[PDB]
Amino acid sequence: NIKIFSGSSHQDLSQKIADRLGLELGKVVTKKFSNQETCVEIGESVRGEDVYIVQSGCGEINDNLMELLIMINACKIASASRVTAVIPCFPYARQDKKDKSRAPISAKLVANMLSVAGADHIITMDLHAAQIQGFFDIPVDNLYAEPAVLKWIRENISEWRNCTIVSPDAGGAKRVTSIADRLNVDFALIHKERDRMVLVGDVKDRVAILVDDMADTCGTICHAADKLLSAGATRVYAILTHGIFSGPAISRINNACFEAVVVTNTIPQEDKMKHCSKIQVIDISMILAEAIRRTHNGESVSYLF
Amino acid sequence: NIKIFSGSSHQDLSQKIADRLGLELGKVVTKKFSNQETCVEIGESVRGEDVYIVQSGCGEINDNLMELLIMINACKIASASRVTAVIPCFPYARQDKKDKSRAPISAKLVANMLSVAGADHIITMDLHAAQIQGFFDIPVDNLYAEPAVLKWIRENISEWRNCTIVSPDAGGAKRVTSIADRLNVDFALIHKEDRMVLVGDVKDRVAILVDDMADTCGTICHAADKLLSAGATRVYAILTHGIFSGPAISRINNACFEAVVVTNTIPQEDKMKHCSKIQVIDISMILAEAIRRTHNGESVSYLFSHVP
Amino acid sequence: NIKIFSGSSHQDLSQKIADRLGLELGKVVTKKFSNQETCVEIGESVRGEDVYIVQSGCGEINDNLMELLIMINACKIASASRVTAVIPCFPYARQDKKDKSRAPISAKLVANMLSVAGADHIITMDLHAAQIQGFFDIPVDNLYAEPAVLKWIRENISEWRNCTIVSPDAGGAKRVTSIADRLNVDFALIHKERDRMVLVGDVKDRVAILVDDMADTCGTICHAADKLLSAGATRVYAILTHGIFSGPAISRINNACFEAVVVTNTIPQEDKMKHCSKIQVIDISMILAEAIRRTHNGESVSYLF
Amino acid sequence: NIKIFSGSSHQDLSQKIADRLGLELGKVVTKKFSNQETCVEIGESVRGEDVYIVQSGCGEINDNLMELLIMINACKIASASRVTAVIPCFPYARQDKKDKSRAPISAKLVANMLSVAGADHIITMDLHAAQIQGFFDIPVDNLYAEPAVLKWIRENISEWRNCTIVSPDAGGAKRVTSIADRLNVDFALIHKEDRMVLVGDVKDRVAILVDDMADTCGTICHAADKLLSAGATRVYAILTHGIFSGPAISRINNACFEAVVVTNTIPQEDKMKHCSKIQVIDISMILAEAIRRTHNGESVSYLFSHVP
Amino acid sequence: NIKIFSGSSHQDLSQKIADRLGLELGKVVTKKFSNQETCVEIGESVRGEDVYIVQSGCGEINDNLMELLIMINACKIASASRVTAVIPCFPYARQDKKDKSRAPISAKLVANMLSVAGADHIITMDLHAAQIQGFFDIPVDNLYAEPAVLKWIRENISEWRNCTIVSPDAGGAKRVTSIADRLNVDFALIHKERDRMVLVGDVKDRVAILVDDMADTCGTICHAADKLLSAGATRVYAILTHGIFSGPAISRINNACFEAVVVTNTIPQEDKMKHCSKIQVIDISMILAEAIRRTHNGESVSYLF
Amino acid sequence: NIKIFSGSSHQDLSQKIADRLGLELGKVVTKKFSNQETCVEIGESVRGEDVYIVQSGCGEINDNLMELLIMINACKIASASRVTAVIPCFPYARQDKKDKSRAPISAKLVANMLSVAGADHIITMDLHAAQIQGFFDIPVDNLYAEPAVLKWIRENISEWRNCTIVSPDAGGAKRVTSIADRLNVDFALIHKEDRMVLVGDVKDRVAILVDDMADTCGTICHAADKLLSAGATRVYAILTHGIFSGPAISRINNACFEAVVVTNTIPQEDKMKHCSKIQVIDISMILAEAIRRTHNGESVSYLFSHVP
To answer: Region (Binding of phosphoribosylpyrophosphate): which ranges (chains A, C, E)?
Structure first.
């Protein structure tokens, strides 16, 4: 009655999820045409079934989005009973406001494409902005890596009782104060004179944990680390839920005084972990598997929060 | 071929806007029942016209919202060419996320209600969260009171070049860092844990609490004490939307504020009578200009950093 | 699997319905903000459930409507399987046509808001105009108080065999002729020179029963009564399904020669019944409970007609 | 930049309207199959233009409806700037409620079909029930034949100042009381139980049966007898829509009517040949005016109580 | 739980389908008003049921379409759980493109009307163009008569091993090459100088089987037959899935050298078969019944392909 | 009040179109990330304007599609009066049916994406299947390269009056019979079973393979051999959309083609450098004209059989 499919080369996360649920990934034929034009073909019947498609992790964001939309469309017209998009890292989530410009609100375009593609429900983790849930009319379940992060902080950082949760920018305030409140420690924030960086909050003679929802080139995260050192920080960690490590990223964190860099399984990290030793990954496949099972059985998903 | 109508008897703001455009407000016959069931009738033809309806300032948010929706409906089925909702202070804006609870995203519901009611365009000031524009599919022009605030500051605070812009909560960091950078001064943030914590330099400086709105004012009043305790010379509070419900007025009269500044996105006259610490910045010209430019198809972005 | 929630202070009707169904009302947190801004929070999971929200009866029509829409939205995004709005007295139902004016068709605005809020089905009683069912694309079940009214007329009025069903205005013709046909008696109608009132039909030397779907200030209903007396009516009753008694209402019916005024439970009457003795209420909670149960079990609801 | 097209060969009404606007009807190539499958082709460009399609009077309601929908579709995908459906007599209008049965609300389905077909505006005359405007989300202008009826009455019935306007059923009370009040005379109502009952004064007065439409005329014919039996001097019947299907014509030729008056919202020529009691009120000018004003963005409400 | 209704006078196909499923056709009241205005009334409850309405076969295409839409609407607002339109011969399917004219895409108008009427799923046979499935957003299952046609060709035509599948026009190329490939024979195509007819492909001294999705007046089909004869064809058959035989049709095929004309049950043929002997019908009721049963039980429908 | 913008740096076609209209391309600030996440910013106001966005020729179809959708979104929420998507070569057009498989109808998904993105009108050239217009509800103008092809033929092939127009597959019969009839010559069709079969007269005649698009060219290359083997004098291949991915170029350089002709609906410069058998027909004037007429509300059908 339940069916789980995956997209593109990536299958690590999808395979983990399927295993935890005691299922095999559904059969899906995929042939890439001329100019990356995506071809997808559901290798089995999904008629009357509760379908879950897990987003691929093949870097190319536009090929991934299209493959996901095409799969959703194929299942829908193949009379699937319900289609849910499991998207650990919501694409274009950062493009969620005009920001004083003649810019697109791409995250809303995406929510609309997903909806028109035929998605009936969304399962994602740590939306860049909680307001994005409102970009849909269909139900969205936004999971959190926070519990896992807190737990990891307590078990791997000895001086955590007196550490400081630091935000790379002004926009991450709420995220770090929330984590800082749970741990009962101090918080601090860095801001790039929008240039030089300014820091508010107490980090002197104590471990500084940089927390952010995501990191790409890691330019910011690496500069914030140097700043924290100059501020007299003991050791600076960097915890991200989504590790879009790209470009300089790999070399940057190595050449950075990061004691360690923790990221989740929301994006493939096997390739980068090899060329970067200070990187550790928190597996969130169990959380995702549990939300699917609970969504299917109609049980509480908020429990995982 | 422009037509401007006002929500209810609170013509106040809507009449200033109309004056600035060289127009009179459109005729609207409004009958109301005991259960507050709103009756509306457009007293003039709006056929083929560019209509603007400015939300009333009554105070009762559900009556005002329904009256706005009803007027939009009436104009749309009366063949208005276009209907724009001018909503200075967006209703339910603070209810824009589930926040880890089985809560409604009321701001999204409101956007959908305005949409199905027949709204073709929205004009508002300082949405509680910029992401709210994404709750609509129709175009939204979110005007800023910033230019007017930066001007009030430069013109009313002698020490502005050495002041600190303070956010009353963590969520406002971006807004204050933004004003601090334009002015080239320090910024600071207050985070409520039931204890307030302050990060940022305010010692021997004038502290300016800046936020989008103030309701019961319990937060800004407490932040002010915190700031003085931290060595601030004097404290100001500048919010774009002055709700001031409940004990706010009494709370402000007893607070150590040098002054509390708000725009007139919400009627402030009654409140001022009982509170002298309040000063109002008029934003009718900014709204009047967005409407005029919207109608003429001219740039409205000019208003984001320019006081007409 | 089934869940029933109620809104605002009112809970009399909702509690009766829940009891008849052997259920407790679902947990819903409610805190009213500054200017009556409505805050609602579903106190329990409704994921995969058949949900029924019963409209509150706290007079303020706009606060009631909003609270209902907000509750519907919260349940919908909380992954409820289906949401049904049980609205005994459909708000703005009288505003269902332009009527030769540049007026809104508010009843349609409401149907649209309800639909966009996420309602999948509507259960109401005695719609002001049957055409309102067409203002929705979703299924609407319009229940009738008629059977109960007829029954009440037979058991409480001795001279009913030869009474006259009277309509307060020209617009209630169909309503009274239908009831008059079932009882096999005469019908009459009153009209305000649209002023003085005119009456057509035979009421001389016989009990006159004024029937209408609703009454607010009761100005009309009270004038029609005086008229009926001058016409030589024996005794004049007034039967309404929706008793929006407001303003003068209470005092008016007392100072009116009404033998009795019968209304249904669709709107709270406990407060007004105290200051008005000639008022009797027909409880329709059983009818509503039965339509919900039948809607849930997929059984015939028309049976209740 | 206005374009008017006719449903089918029943140019009749559509040609009068066109004449009154100083226009010719647009070219339309129409091919039809044996199974009545309608083929349509807009013989001229409608790109960027204000299009009006007037429903044909063929008689076969489903063929006419489909032909109308098809033409609307063709114009819309051919980039017409706006497409208005001019439907004098709204199809399935009598099917506007479930009426306690597991019935379809066909009038709502029709409104949805016209909407999805691409209609941006509707112009009709005397909807069977005003609530029908609410079946659409697009604007609807529901014109009244009342002004024309009140004029025919004042001009054709000597005793109009002492006549009685009678409704053939309970549902028409509002419509007759409305005409009775404007004229300042009595009104009466007939209710069918299989026996008719009459309430209202008709004794020694001219009785005018007024309704929105007459089909088989079984009702108005029986009401007329009832009225004469009640002491009416003579009986008239004035309906806006003259369907006259089945035995209607034979039924009218044998009825005690002084005359039967209808508008030309439906072709009446063939019917008149076999029935001399029929007289037609031309409403083309009223429709032509609503179109002209719709196009110019001018008040159409003027027509509700004024015969152009 | 499952309910099958039929429309208008036609009930042959609908009755066959119901029998194969072991059911009686649902009760539906139908009274035709003045000018063919369609009146429909569901004679039984369909609340919470999986409903299937089979299109009538009463020639008048517009009365049939409307009756179908009206039935769909009535079931939908009567709280039916799901409504599926079973339409063997999709109306206006040939009007599926502008074709270099200011023409309507009627097939899309129809798909939209069906959708707005409330249809949740479509079951049809041999769509004039497969692209029409894309005119809907709802699931469409397009069945094929091909298997049955091939089978019939093998059992009724002795020289089939060396016959030629002929297309009446250029537009039927794909249809005939597909059938010709399955049988492993030659294909040919005829074209009207768009006049005289041209023929490409080898038909000399061999049976010619004209294949087309539909035939109305049969003008084309009959001319193609004469052409095939002049080309030196042994015997010319004509196989159509949809036999819209109208106008001259009946007389035309008789006066035509057609060895035989095969058509399916998608349209009533009992009346025409009497006045035309060379006509044979392949019953597709079992195929339709099987798709309904499979759609209801959530089993594979593609199996029938 | 017309505004034309280009998808990406592949201004090529979009710049020619702009030149032909006497305009410059609108300013667009485009930032792109490593994961190819597209960032766009309209560098000028489009408020109340008629906007045209011409899809880029980058090559990566998903990046180009997303960039197009994003730009449409940005313009729409920036209050453009109308936004038209000029898509010379429609993405996923070949994926327009299930074809007896549990496949997606990607061309329909793309139409829906463009619709919800906010597209009000589509302008494309030679949709793979005319039925694709029906995948939208908004108007679509599907331009033909035929007039330009018929002209290239008459002007470049001496024997055109005695040539044969050949379809590389069964599905193209209609398209070739159509060109064959206008020219008044023979036609032929090739059907791939893994063996090609040819029906039609090509003996001693110049054979012109005509199709809407050519990708890997495996088919046209094989069809050419087949044609020469059948007695064709020489073979040509004329496709409107020149994809030429994979081994196409190498495949064409080794094929027995006299020449391979394509339009510039897709950039062809890089391909031409490595392939001299390729010749390009410029269709910018045809696209420029459709835009100009679309904007002025003038007939665009004129272009279906007339080379501007």
So the answer is: 204-219
Cα–Cα distances in angstroms (integers) from residue D201 to residues C163, C164, C198, D233, D259, in the given order? 21, 18, 11, 12, 21
Residue pair E283/E151 in contact by the 8 Å Cβ criterion: no
What sign has the CA pseudo-torsion E103, E106, E107, E109? Answer: positive
Give every strand in the sheet of E121-125, ordered side by side.
E2-6, E50-54, E82-87, E121-125, E140-143
F140 CA: distance to closest CA in chain E (Å): 10
Token pair in block for residue C154 = 């037979």
Q: How many whole angstroms separate alpha carbon C296 and alpha carbon A108?
A: 35
By the 8 A CB rule, do B206 and B232 touch?
A: yes
Q: How far apart are CA B279 and CA B258, in angstroms?
A: 11
Q: Please, where in chain E does CATH 3.40.50.2020 lie?
A: 1-144+283-303, 145-282
CA–CA dist D133, D136 (Å, integer): 6
Interface of D with C (CB under 8 A): 96-100, 102, 105, 107-108, 112, 129-135, 137, 142, 144, 170-171, 173-174, 177-178, 181, 187-189, 191, 193, 197, 199-201, 301, 304
Rounded to whole angstroms, the Cα distance separating F87 from F113 reads: 14
Say which amino acid occupies B259: A
**CB-based contact E93:E129 (threshold 8 Å):** yes
C-alpha angle with apex C275: C270 to C277, nearest 5 degrees?
85
Dihedral of the CA atoms E252, E253, E257, E262 (nearest 10)? 160
With residue E162 as reference, give the H or E element that holds it: none
Q: Residue F36 phi/psi, 5° resolution?
A: 70, 15
Question: Which residue type is seen at B5?
Answer: F
Residues of each annotated binding site of B:
94-99, 126, 128, 137, 141
Alpha helices in F22-143 (DSSP H): 61-77, 106-117
Cβ-contact F52, F86 below 8 angstroms: yes
Resolution of the coordinates, Å: 2.2
Longest CA pairwise span in chain B (Å)? 61
Enumerate chain A positions whose Cβ falls within 8 A of a Cβ in C: 121, 133, 137, 139-141, 295, 297-302
Which site among E121, E136, E301, E303 would you substitute to test the A interface, given the most A Cβ atoms closer than 10 Å to its Cβ? Answer: E301
Q: Do D10 and D267 touch, CB atoms closer than 8 A?
A: yes
The token duo for E103 is: 């023409």
Q: Where in chain F is the domain with CATH 3.40.50.2020?
A: 1-144+282-302, 145-281
Task: Spell out the CATH class of D1-144+282-302.
Answer: alpha beta
Count of C-beta atoms within a 10 Å radius of residue B29: 12
What approach was used to elucidate this structure?
Answer: X-ray
Element (H, E) at B6: strand B2-6
Question: What CATH number was assigned to the domain covering residues F145-281?
Answer: 3.40.50.2020
Beta carbons of F130 and E99 less than 8 angstroms apart? yes
Residues 6+ apart with CB under 8 A from E189: E166, E167, E169, E170, E172, E173, E176, E199, E200, E201, F173, F189, F199
d(CA C127, CA A38): 52
Taking the C-alpha atoms of residue E109 and residue D39, their distance in angstroms, rounded to an integer, is 13
> Phi then psi for D163, rounded to 5 degrees?
-95, 175
Alpha carbon of E125: minimum distance to chain D alpha carbons (Å): 19
Q: Are D256 and D224 in contact (CB under 8 A)?
A: yes
DSSP bridge partners of B80: B47
Classify domain C1-144+283-303 by CATH number: 3.40.50.2020
Question: Token match 């849909």: residue?
Answer: A136
Q: A21 near A55, Cβ under 8 Å?
A: no
CATH of E145-282, one of 3.40.50.2020, 3.40.50.2000, 3.30.70.270, 3.40.50.1980: 3.40.50.2020
